[PDB]
């Protein structure tokens, strides 16, 4: 385990966790800030976990999941492409529009080919 620098075809898995049980009762989403663009909702999951959203570019490749018991949300990223290069964040869908400042810290994923 070193950093987010990987090459295409590789897979990674991201986790987002917080103290307490804050994510419970909220749908959660993974966001990314790629160079040039504004926020993109990459994947989301309803409060129950019964339903799921994926951006077109990552559908088939990414997988979202939640564990309210551990207050943790996950994004399994298979078959990374260079276009997946971004800072990744997770947030409550009720808060997807807030300034990055009020969000967590964020992790770079950097894909090469």
């Amino acid at each position: 385990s070193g950093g987010g620098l990987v090459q295409a075809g590789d897979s990674l898995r991201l986790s987002c966790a917080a103290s307490g049980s804050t994510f419970s009762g909220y749908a959660m989403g993974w966001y990314r800030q790629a160079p040039g663009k504004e926020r993109e909702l990459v994947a989301a999951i309803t409060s129950s976990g019964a339903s799921t959203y994926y951006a077109d570019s990552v559908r088939g490749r990414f997988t979202i999941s939640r564990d309210d018991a551990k207050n943790t949300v996950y994004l399994q990223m298979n078959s990374l492409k260079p276009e997946d290069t971004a800072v990744y964040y997770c947030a409550a869908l009720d808060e997807g529009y807030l300034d990055y400042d009020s969000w967590g810290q964020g992790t770079q994923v950097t894909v090469s080919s």
Binding site: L14, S15, C16, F23, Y89, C90, G104, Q105, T107
Partner: peptide, 6 residues
Amino acid sequence: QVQLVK
């Protein structure tokens, strides 16, 4: 949310 890892 706070920290994201990996």
